[PDB]
């Protein structure tokens, strides 16, 4: 049946196209999720560094004052 063949091939091509598009979508979502996670971790490190430095600078300024 040429008709049966034609119909099933069309649906199957469409299903490949679908599943490959889904793969692309989920991969893009996953990269965005990973990038958010990376950035939160990087910014946690930076924020701890910055708060350490603010405390250290404040201590140094007290030492300067100790001599004026």
């Amino acid at each position: 049946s040429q008709e049966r063949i034609k119909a099933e091939r069309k649906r199957l091509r469409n299903r490949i196209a679908a599943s490959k598009c889904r793969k692309r979508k989920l991969e893009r979502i996953s990269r965005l999720e990973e990038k958010v996670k990376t950035l939160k971790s990087q910014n946690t490190e930076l924020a701890s560094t910055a708060s350490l430095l603010r405390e250290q600078v404040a201590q140094l300024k007290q030492k300067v004052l100790s001599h004026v």
């Binding site: 965005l32 950035l39 930076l46 250290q56 600078v57 030492k63």
Partner: protein
Amino acid sequence: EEEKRRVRRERNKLAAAKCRNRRRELTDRLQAETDQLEEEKAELESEIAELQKEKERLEFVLVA
């Protein structure tokens, strides 16, 4: 008659469009969080640079 197939294709295209709009909701939220986090990272890098400059200034004062 075969307009059954017409309604079904219009409906399929609407279901696809709603699913793509849900996908875009998710990726837009994630992209906006990412933008925000990149700006906050830049700010933190700049702050650290300024604080470290001030720290070295003060250390120099204190060695004299």
